[PDB]
Amino acid sequence: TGDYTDCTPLLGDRAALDSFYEEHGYLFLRNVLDRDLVKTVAEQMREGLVALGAADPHATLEELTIDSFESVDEVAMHDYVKYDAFWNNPSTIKVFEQVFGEPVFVFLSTTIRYYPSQAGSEEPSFHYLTPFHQDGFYIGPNQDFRTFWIPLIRTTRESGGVALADGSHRRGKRDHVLNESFRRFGHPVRGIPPTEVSEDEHLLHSPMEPGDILLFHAHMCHKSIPNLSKDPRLMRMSMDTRVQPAKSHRGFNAMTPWTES
Numbered sequence: 001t002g003d004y005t006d007c008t009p010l011l012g013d014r015a016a017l018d019s020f021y022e023e024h025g026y027l028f029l030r031n032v033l034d035r036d037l038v039k040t041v042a043e044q045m046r047e048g049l050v051a052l053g054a055a056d057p058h059a060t061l062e063e064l065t066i067d068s069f070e071s072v073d074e075v076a077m078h079d080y081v082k083y084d085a086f087w088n089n090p091s092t093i094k095v096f097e098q099v100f101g102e103p104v105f106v107f108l109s110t111t112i113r114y115y116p117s118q119a120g121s122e123e124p125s126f127h128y129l130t131p132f133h134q135d136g137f138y139i140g141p142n143q144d145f146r147t148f149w150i151p152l153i154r155t156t157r158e159s160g161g162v163a164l165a166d167g168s169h170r171r172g173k174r175d176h177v178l179n180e181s182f183r184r185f186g187h188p189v190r191g192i193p194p195t196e197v198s199e200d201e202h203l204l205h206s207p208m209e210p211g212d213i214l215l216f217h218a219h220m221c222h223k224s225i226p227n228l229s230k231d232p233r234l235m236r237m238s239m240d241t242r243v244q245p246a247k248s249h250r251g252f253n254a255m256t257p258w259t260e261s
């Protein structure tokens with residue numbers, strides 16, 4: 001469980017950036033998004049949690065917690081968090097265009113995540129997290145989109161985020177099988193057996209700061225890391241969308257907001 005390689009030095013170099021991405025199936029970029037814009041999104045999520053998660057109205061972002069992710073009306077949270085305005089801000093688009101080397105289309109769907117620490121819990125609720133999977137298994141038909149994952153407040157090794165299997169995107173779609181320990185809508189979801197992820201596809205996770213981006217290939221095998229933070233005990237607050245060349249086919253998920261899919 002190593003660390004992401006910082007790819008920010010490669011942004012000035014089309015060839016070098018693409019070569020890294022091709023080999024590894026991800027890019028980790030530090031301090032490339034407008035931190036004021038990110039903070040505004042974080043504070044929108046915070047206000048949603050005050051209104052819907054019974055979060056402390058006087059807590060700072062890092063003091064924030066909620067009793068239960070599940071007790072929060074996720075549909076209502078989408079009214080609070082103004083992600084489309086963020087993704088489509090010129091400063092954000094510029095970074096996306098640097099990554100792709102061409103004009104882009106940002107998905108109309110974004111997933112917002114507000115996961116409290118469950119350090120010390122004997123029966124923790126982590127069924128709302130994700131098993132090993134590839135976004136391309138459930139998004140298509142085109143497979144040239146990339147997932148863009150951003151922290152809204154900082155993450156730590158203990159507070160979690162997403163773990164990536166380095167270079168796991170080079171053998172196409174992998175088998176996803178029912179996993180009863182991960183659920184959406186009472187339905188179990190499908191994941192890649194952890195045994196079917198090679199020891200050679202080294203698992204990576206680094207702490208990230210608001211302003212940072214993690215992005216990865218449609219066939220990158222990745223999974224949630226649970227929040228077991230204690231000192232500091234932090235929420236993990238993040239959001240993820242998908243982005244693709246403006247010219248590429250725009251599928252169902254690309255055109256359909258989260259609340260309707």
Ligand SMILES: C[C@H]1CC[C@@H]2C(C(=O)O)=C[C@H]3CC(C)(C)C[C@]213
Nearest residue numbers: 111130131133138184189190191
């Ligand atoms: C495979 C699992 C984990 C990734 C996706 C996910 C997520 O939260 O990213 C929840 C499941 C529902 C889904 C149909 C969108 C597919 C999911």
Ligand SMILES: O=C(O)CNC(=O)C(=O)O
Nearest residue numbers: 130147149161162224240
């Ligand atoms: O953030 C998480 O726990 C899981 N995220 C993803 O699977 C993603 O962004 O594609």
Ligand SMILES: [Fe+3]
Nearest residue numbers: 130133134135
């Ligand atoms: Fe995913």
Ligand SMILES: [Mg+2]
Nearest residue numbers: 056057058059
């Ligand atoms: Mg107080």
Ligand SMILES: [Mg+2]
Nearest residue numbers: 169170171172
């Ligand atoms: Mg392939």
